[PDB]
Amino acid sequence: RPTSRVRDESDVIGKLNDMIEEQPTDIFLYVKLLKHHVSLKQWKQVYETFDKLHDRFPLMANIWCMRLSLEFDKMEELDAAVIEPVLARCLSKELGNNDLSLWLSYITYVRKKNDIITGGEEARNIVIQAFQVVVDKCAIFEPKSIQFWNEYLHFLEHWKPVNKFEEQQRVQYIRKLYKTLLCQPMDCLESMWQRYTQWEQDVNHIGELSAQYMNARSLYQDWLNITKGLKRNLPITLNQATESNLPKPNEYDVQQLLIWLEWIRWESDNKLELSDDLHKARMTYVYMQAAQHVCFAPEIWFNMANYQGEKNTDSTVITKYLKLGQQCIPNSAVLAFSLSEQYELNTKIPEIETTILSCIDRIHLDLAALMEDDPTNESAINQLKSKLTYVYCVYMNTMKRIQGLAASRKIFGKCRRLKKLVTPDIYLENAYIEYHISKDTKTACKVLELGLKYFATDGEYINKYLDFLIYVNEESQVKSLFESSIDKISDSHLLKMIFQKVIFFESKVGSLNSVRTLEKRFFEKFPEVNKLEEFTNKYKVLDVNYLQRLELDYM
Amino acid sequence: ESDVIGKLNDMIEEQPTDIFLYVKLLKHHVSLKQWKQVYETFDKLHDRFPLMANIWCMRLSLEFDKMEELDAAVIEPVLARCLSKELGNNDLSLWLSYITYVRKKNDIITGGEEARNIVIQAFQVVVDKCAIFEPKSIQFWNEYLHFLEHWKPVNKFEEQQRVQYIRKLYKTLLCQPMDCLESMWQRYTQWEQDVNQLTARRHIGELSAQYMNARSLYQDWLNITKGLKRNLPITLNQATESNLPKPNEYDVQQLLIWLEWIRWESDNKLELSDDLHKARMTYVYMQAAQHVCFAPEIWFNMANYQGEKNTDSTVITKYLKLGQQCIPNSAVLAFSLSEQYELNTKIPEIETTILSCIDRIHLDLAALMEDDPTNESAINQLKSKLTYVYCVYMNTMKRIQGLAASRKIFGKCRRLKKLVTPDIYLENAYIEYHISKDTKTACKVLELGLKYFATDGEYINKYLDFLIYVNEESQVKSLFESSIDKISDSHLLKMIFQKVIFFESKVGSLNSVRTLEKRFFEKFPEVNKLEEFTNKYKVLDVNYLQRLELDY
């Protein structure tokens, strides 16, 4: 739709803004548009662009990073009028990001705005506070956090106390630091212990700690193994963004998604033994780390969602997280339905139709986009057509029991309108509900008939159609359809499967003389067919062929 | 007690298809020379197994070993019965017995004319009836040969007919697939020369065409056969427990080799006329019904082959019947028969035949439940065969003789309790339903069923499926409730929650779903919250949320 016909000249800013509109989740495309506006120093558009990105991906910590970075690089112009409102938004209470790289940014700023020199008291006394919150909110939950612990450390050591009420607090802190770090699974405990030992001597216990340090040192071994191949390579600067280290729409390494679910599973055991708030934290941390690095996996959002709602009340929590998940994957049926389901519970009936509907809109456009970028890939297309229809079916059903039969009609009315773009399952699924009204076959039957308009050649359809006629016992009906399509049904392996069905049906419904004939026609169009193997199918009782499992178990 | 004749006549009554037991009872009456009992015993074997050609052999043999006493009063009526028209046996080992007799009762010396002239006729019928259909026939072709060669013509009207015959012989043999065509040609060449080598060439040319054709047709045969086994004993003393099939036994490998050889034959590579090919077939079919006699498939197929031919509504039935006599407990053959009796409209045997199959299975079950009741699998495997036939019997009688009939039957299945399987209440239920799509009656049935199967998840699962099918909301809640504890296993109970949950969804509420869903994950912690979320959203027995999005 856009791109095609919306043909601009040859001004990057226009095709990009067009391609982005077609793939609003391709993070890289925005990165290119930014790179461009920054090179033309059109700073106003840089923020419009960063904001559309923040709007859609609130918890993509690294995108906030790329942004704070951009400012910091203006040297002496670390403008607190631009900088603070950003941090303020991305470090908030709800869509509050908790990632180390971003905190290391938060710190750098706090350190450039409170000079240890001319500030004195609250100066070096605020930087400490800033280093502490990063320690409580995230440093103690991240095993690959060493780099930070060092940062905080060096700032405490390289500090000369002016008197003695300081000389003291400096060790009071240098202690509370070391102790804190040494009790968590980390990539540098071994060395960091060797350091604290020596430290304590040349200053004036270690037995107590020694315990949790051991426990830690090895809990980091299990970690290191569960992780093993964990990839965490998102760019945190604009220039480091490469097509290769940002996910393309709907992309994501399964291997990775599995390593993450695994780490999360481990965490949920609570091997550390933390209180209920400290463990709820430690998981929430890991969960947001995963939603950042495999953001396009609908299962990580699905799971994080339920983990946060599994907690306490507030009917809004579960919906909050699916919503964010749907924003990263606008085309996910997993997420659409999960939302659709929550809206129904907190009873907001209007959004139920809204959300599902969008997912369809997104899929519609994805289908269209492929039918044109390479219409020769008839599988990838049917795969989509299938997904389109599947969603329609779930929609129709869901509308039918939420807003009367007349609703379902509306929907199916328009699926028809789509023709061959949809798949047979919509008429079958419509049929089966158009029936269940008042067990009547008058209306319900007229449906599939229509369908025959586009699918009288899909043995796949016909089969499922007979299965219905047979199901809702309508004898004549079967004979009719069977007849009409023995030539018109492509394939063979599927037509065969269709004969056996109607023959088995004939048998159950009297005659045996009728059977005797269909049986003749069958073997003519299918010479070579094993007379006795097909004999057994005619006598399956309860979908099971016992003749074969008991006597001819060699068949 | 401890008198062989009694335990044997007992065991035999328990396994009337165990051919070895009759052979023992016979070895016994023979060593006591109670000849009148030997015949009664042989005849019971003949009654049940008409075409076990090799049993007629053991019996003719027995007589021939009474030396001078080749009593044509005993012998002839035997041959006459086992070489007749309908149950006429066509096996080469039996014909070699028939010739042996015909040679002892028509001496070449004192008979002269019709003497060696009747012996030839006998050799000739063995040639037209079977010798030319059997490729491992070499042994016979030799016999006939030596009898023609070792014959010096008294004059010249003989000198001639002798080579007229030795010709007609060699010609006939070299034209069919055989285990010694190579050597038999080498022989026929030299023969034509030392008889008129002025035309050894101009003749041998013609034959040389089909001789080749055969020499290679025998090569395919030899390949398809390769591992064929044909070792039945043809004398009473060669019968060992190991070379006679135990009741219902039969190498599958063998049955396949036979069906294969029969397919080959049906292609008609030989190019024979329509009666000559129909014979060649019938020969091989009878060979197969002798060596894998307890395989219902061979009898089944032989049967339809002989019917597929022309008219005579009784042909297919004749053969199914002999096969059922070999395997009284065959559901395949009982229904095949039951079906035939129905076409030739003799409704009364429809019930008879199915019923005996049942009797035999009942007896089979009983006997296993006793000889080794620890083998609970082999037991249920049977209780399932018992019930399966009952169901088919019940359905069959339902449309053949009214609903009241199905009742009678199911009424006696109940009488059986746990000896039968759950499928009978399910099957009865689905019919008791289809009367007038009413659920009052059809439902009271499965309830009964609950008496013995309230613990079989397998049953409860299938029960629900029905409740759901014939949409009866509450009913599903009730059953679901009542058995979440009483249902053994887990893998089955889990499958049961899912089902009832997917049902709850389809039938409004979603707040009800919300709850069941809760109880589910409690009794089943560890269950993948998202995997079970997809199942609830299947559309047409298919979980697309999984095949399309979460396809890993």
CA pair distance A292, A288, nearest whole angstrom:
6
Show the CA angle centred on residue A342, arms to residues A338 and A348, nearest 5°: 135
**Per-residue DSSP letters for B11-63?**
HHHH-TT-HHHHHHHHHHHHHTT-HHHHHHHHHHHHHH-TT-HHHHHHHHHHH
**A chain contacts of residue B539, beta-carbon cutoff 8 Å:** 390, 393-394, 397, 425, 429
- Residue B384 tokens read as 């399932």
Please name the residue ranges forming H helices in A229-377.
254-267, 276-293, 298-309, 317-328, 333-345, 349-373
Q: Do residues B281 and B309 lie in contact, with contact meaning Cβ atoms separated by under 8 Å?
A: no
Determine the 3-state secondary structure of B521 from DSSP: helix
CATH number of the domain to which A477 belongs:
1.25.40.1040
CA pair distance B395, B431, nearest whole angstrom:
8
**B chain contacts of residue A532, beta-carbon cutoff 8 Å:** 297, 300-301, 332
Q: Which residues contact A501 (CB under 8 A, 6 or more apart)?
A: A463, A466, A467, A470
Q: Do residues B181 and B218 lie in contact, with contact meaning Cβ atoms separated by under 8 Å?
A: yes
**Per-residue DSSP letters for B371-406?**
H-TT-HHHHHHHHHHHHHHHHHHHHHHHHHH-HHHH
Q: Do residues A525 and A486 lie in contact, with contact meaning Cβ atoms separated by under 8 Å?
A: yes
**B chain contacts of residue A393, beta-carbon cutoff 8 Å:** 539-540
Q: Which residues contact B77 (CB under 8 A, 6 or more apart)?
A: none
Q: What is the resolution of this structure in A?
A: 3.0
**Per-residue DSSP letters for A497-531?**
HHHHHHHHHHHHTS-STTHHHHHHHHHHHSTT--H
Q: Is A369 exposed, middle or buried (0-12, 13-18, 19+ CB in 10 A)?
A: middle
Amino acid at B236: L
Residue A231 vs residues A138, A142, A260, A320: alpha-carbon distances, Å? 19, 15, 10, 27
For A478, the enclosing helix (H) or strand (E) is: helix A475-484
**Torsion A198-A203-A205-A208 (CA) sign:** negative
Q: Nearest residue on chain B to A553, judged by CA atoms? A: B252
> How far is C-alpha B94 from the geometric centre of its chain's CA atoms?
22
Which of A390, A473, A542 is closest, CB to CB, to B544?
A: A390
- Residue A106 tokens read as 């938060």
Cβ–Cβ contacts within 10 Å for residue A242, how many?
A: 11
Residue B267 vs residues A23, B257, B260, B409: alpha-carbon distances, Å? 64, 16, 11, 46
CA pair distance A115, A113, nearest whole angstrom:
6
CA pair distance A288, A284, nearest whole angstrom:
6
Q: Do residues B94 and B88 lie in contact, with contact meaning Cβ atoms separated by under 8 Å?
A: no
Q: Is A29 exposed, middle or buried (0-12, 13-18, 19+ CB in 10 A)?
A: buried
**What distance, in Å, lies between the first and last C-alpha atoms of chain B?**
69
Residue contacts between A and B (CB atoms, under 8 Å): 109
CA pair distance B547, B543, nearest whole angstrom:
7
Q: Please judge whether B301 and A344 are an interchain contact, meaning their C-beta atoms are less than 8 angstroms apart.
A: no
Residue A224 vs residues A186, A188, B331: alpha-carbon distances, Å? 9, 12, 62
Q: Please judge whether A542 and B506 are an interchain contact, meaning their C-beta atoms are less than 8 angstroms apart.
A: no
Q: Nearest residue on chain A to B397, judged by CA atoms? A: A510
- Residue B196 tokens read as 């008129």
Q: Please judge whether A341 and B508 are an interchain contact, meaning their C-beta atoms are less than 8 angstroms apart.
A: no
Q: How was this entry determined?
A: X-ray
Question: Mutate which of A539, A540, A543, A548 to test chain B, going by most B C-beta atoms within 10 A?
Answer: A539
Which of B97, B91, B103, B94 shows the shortest CA–CA distance to B65?
Answer: B97
- B405, B411, B417, B420 alpha-carbon torsion, rounded to 10°: 0
Q: Please judge whether A535 and B252 are an interchain contact, meaning their C-beta atoms are less than 8 angstroms apart.
A: no
Q: Please judge whether B342 and A386 are an interchain contact, meaning their C-beta atoms are less than 8 angstroms apart.
A: no
Q: Do residues A327 and A24 lie in contact, with contact meaning Cβ atoms separated by under 8 Å?
A: no
Residue pointed to by tokens 């995997």: B531
Which of B483, B476, B484 shows the shortest CA–CA distance to B519?
Answer: B484
Greatest C-alpha distance within chain A? 112
Q: Do residues A281 and A141 lie in contact, with contact meaning Cβ atoms separated by under 8 Å?
A: yes
Which of B256, B304, B392 is closest, CB to CB, to A541?
A: B392
Q: Do residues B389 and B331 lie in contact, with contact meaning Cβ atoms separated by under 8 Å?
A: yes
- Residue A480 tokens read as 């009719």
Give the gap in angstroms from C-alpha B443 to the nearest C-alpha of chain A.
Answer: 17
Paired with A544 in beta bridges are: A541
B176 Rama class: left (phi>0) / alpha (psi -120 to 50) / beta: beta
Which of A79, A509, A409 shows the shortest CA–CA distance to A538?
Answer: A509
Paired with A541 in beta bridges are: A544
Determine the 3-state secondary structure of B355 from DSSP: helix
**B chain contacts of residue A386, beta-carbon cutoff 8 Å:** 544, 548
> How far is C-alpha B512 from the geometric centre of its chain's CA atoms?
55
Show the CA angle centred on residue A141, arms to residues A137 and A147, nearest 5°: 95
Which of A30, A34, A36, A28 shows the shortest CA–CA distance to A11?
Answer: A36
> How far is C-alpha B80 from the geometric centre of its chain's CA atoms?
27
Which of A3, A44, A7 shows the shortest CA–CA distance to A22?
Answer: A3
**A chain contacts of residue B548, beta-carbon cutoff 8 Å:** 333, 383, 386-387, 390
The structural domain count of chain B equals: 1
Residue pointed to by tokens 């009982």: B334
**What distance, in Å, lies between the first and last C-alpha atoms of chain A?**
55
Which of A218, A150, A220 shows the shortest CA–CA distance to A186?
Answer: A220
**Per-residue DSSP letters for A217-239?**
HHHHHHHHHHHSS------SSGG
CA pair distance B37, B29, nearest whole angstrom:
6
**B chain contacts of residue A436, beta-carbon cutoff 8 Å:** 471
Amino acid at A345: L
CA atoms within 13 A on the CB side of A448: 25
**A chain contacts of residue B424, beta-carbon cutoff 8 Å:** none
- Residue B155 tokens read as 């004059």
For residue B84, what are the domain limits? 1-552
> How far is C-alpha B82 from the geometric centre of its chain's CA atoms?
21
Which of B126, A452, B155 shows the shortest CA–CA distance to B145?
Answer: B126
